Ligand binder design. Structure first.
Ligand SMILES: Cc1cc2c(cc1C)N(C[C@H](O)[C@H](O)[C@H](O)COP(=O)(O)OP(=O)(O)OC[C@H]1O[C@@H](n3cnc4c(N)ncnc43)[C@H](O)[C@@H]1O)c1[nH]c(=O)[nH]c(=O)c1N2
Length: 498
């Protein structure tokens, strides 16, 4: 059937867009391929934890996986599982594996909550056509408020066993002349205190994050999406995957949509049409829909920039072995609190998340997710044979990112007389994991594939809203940028187009 606006997906771009559409009185249907995560499972919890993964951990995989960095300790809990509509999806391309959330709320379900604005000077470099004053004066503050961003209590942080891992890396970085910053979060830090005090059910302090948090984390289902539903103008249909998009003869859009059960069985195929179509299927999902539409002839007026300009936000994982006198703790909060800020906009820039280890015993390992400035980009190329977008990125394209991460952590090792771990990412001696991504950015870049507000070039009333808009890099964890840009874009679109 017909509905005035359709939003594909329910991540950050989608959730912002649907809230503002509903507030403007536009009846809106959101289509989400994953589940609404609200049913207690076999342990009485909605989500599995990192030490008890089960089918809920994984989108259609036959075996659980250890979180990257943790295989040496967490492989013991891996098990065979039924392919199921679980929450975290590892999407494998030829030389890159991208992790994304699947469910109502998208990556907000599975992410570490780190809610950080990019440096304005870097924002201005990456998106020179965008008015940065409005972003920093209006849209970033709006996003932080709506997302329920909050700040850790520094005294509690300094004293608690749960953040010893962070304090150790702070001290070690400091000996190399490198500073740290507290990173705001959407996990409720007041709740986290009460967890440590034994007052409320643990989540961050019970090795939960990457397969969901049963408590504490203000994912989008609690914030933007709850508000969108509260307008009375928004509904969400789950286990509905959009496959194809075409433009009707009178200039609206028609979608083919598959409805599945949680075992992946096809229940129905539906046609849904609309006046305004908003893509919020993520860097991977929105880009795939548009390259498919271009290259199968259903949106033939899409431009050549659709598919282009993808990067992994310079993501590189690495780890250091601490001295025996610098244990990182058996008890590590699953939510990061600190980053090493070595980002100066040069090619040696690094912003490094100090990541927790979920082993639950002492390993002496410090783990880092480095975010770097690497100009290499990949392209999603349609394969008509298999009907998939294939990202053409090669591992050698991450060499500049590795080089920047290694230069920084070499300074820390030199100052402290420590060495890397080489055994955390597989049998091959490898200190830097260079073929994964948690922060996919690009594919439908703002001002390239779209105008400066995400209006898809070649088409009217067709919008992209999400991480596919970002040109490969933001220098920090990306969801605040995605949210703030989505606030800017939908406000303009409603004013001028709707
Ligand atoms: C493990 C891990 C850890 C982190 C992070 C990710 C991951 C995987 N991130 C990244 C962050 O989560 C990510 O950048 C955003 O979720 C991206 O938001 P989008 O709106 O682009 O898509 P997002 O991926 O959130 O949502 C897309 C949604 O569309 C759905 N979908 C896709 N194709 C569809 C289709 N064809 N039909 C229907 N539905 C479809 C998906 O199932 C999904 O729910 C992060 N960022 C950050 O700033 N701070 C952090 O601490 C972290 N930590």
């Amino acid at each position: 059937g017909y509905v005035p606006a359709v939003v594909i997906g329910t991540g950050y771009g989608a959730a912002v867009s649907a809230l503002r559409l509903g507030e403007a009185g536009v009846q809106t249907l959101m289509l989400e391929m994953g589940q609404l995560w609200n049913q207690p499972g076999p342990d009485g919890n909605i989500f599995c934890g990192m030490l008890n993964p089960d089918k809920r951990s994984s989108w259609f995989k036959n075996r659980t996986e250890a979180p990257l960095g943790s295989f040496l300790w967490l492989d013991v809990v891996n098990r065979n599982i039924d392919p199921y509509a679980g929450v975290l999806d590892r999407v494998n391309y030829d030389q890159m594996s991208v992790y994304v959330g699947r469910g109502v709320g998208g990556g907000s379900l599975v992410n570490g909550g780190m809610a950080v604005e990019p440096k304005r000077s870097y924002f201005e470099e990456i998106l020179p056509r965008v008015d940065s004053s409005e972003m920093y004066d209006r849209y970033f503050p709006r996003a932080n408020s709506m997302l329920r961003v909050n700040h850790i209590d520094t005294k509690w942080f300094e004293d608690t066993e749960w953040y010893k891992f962070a304090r150790v890396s702070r001290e070690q970085a400091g000996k190399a002349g490198l500073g740290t910053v507290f990173v705001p979060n959407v996990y409720d830090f007041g709740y986290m205190q009460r967890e440590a005090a034994g007052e409320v059910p643990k989540s961050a302090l019970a090795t939960e994050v990457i397969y969901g948090n049963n408590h504490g984390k203000q994912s989008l289902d609690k914030t933007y999406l709850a508000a969108a539903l509260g307008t009375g103008k928004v509904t969400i249909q789950t286990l509905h995957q959009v496959k194809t998009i075409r433009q009707t003869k009178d200039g609206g859009y028609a979608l083919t949509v598959e409805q599945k059960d949680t075992d992946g069985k096809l229940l129905a195929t539906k046609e849904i049409s609309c006046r305004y179509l908003f893509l919020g299927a993520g860097s991977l999902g929105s880009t795939e829909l548009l390259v498919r539409a271009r290259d199968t002839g259903t949106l033939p007026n899409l431009n050549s920039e659709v598919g282009a300009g993808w990067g992994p936000n310079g993501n590189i994982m690495t780890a250091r072995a601490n001295h025996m006198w610098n244990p990182t703790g058996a008890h590590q909060s699953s939510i990061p609190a600190l980053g090493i800020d070595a980002w100066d906009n040069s090619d040696s820039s690094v912003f490094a998340e100090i990541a927790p280890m979920p082993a639950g015993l002492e390993t002496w390992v410090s783990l880092y997710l480095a975010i770097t400035k690497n100009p290499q980009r990949g392209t999603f190329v349609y394969d008509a044979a298999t009907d998939r977008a294939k990202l053409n990125w090669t591992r050698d394209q991450n060499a500049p990112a590795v080089n920047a991460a290694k230069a920084l952590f070499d300074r820390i090792n030199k100052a402290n007389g420590t060495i890397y771990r080489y055994d955390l990412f597989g049998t091959q001696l490898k200190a830097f994991a260079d073929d994964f991504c948690y922060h996919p950015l690009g594919g439908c870049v703002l001002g390239k594939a779209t105008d400066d507000y995400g209006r898809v070039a070649g088409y009217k009333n067709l919008y992209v809203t999400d991480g596919s808009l970002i040109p490969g890099s933001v220098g920090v964890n990306p969801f605040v940028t995605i949210t703030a840009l989505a606030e800017r874009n939908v406000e303009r679109i409603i004013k001028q187009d709707v």
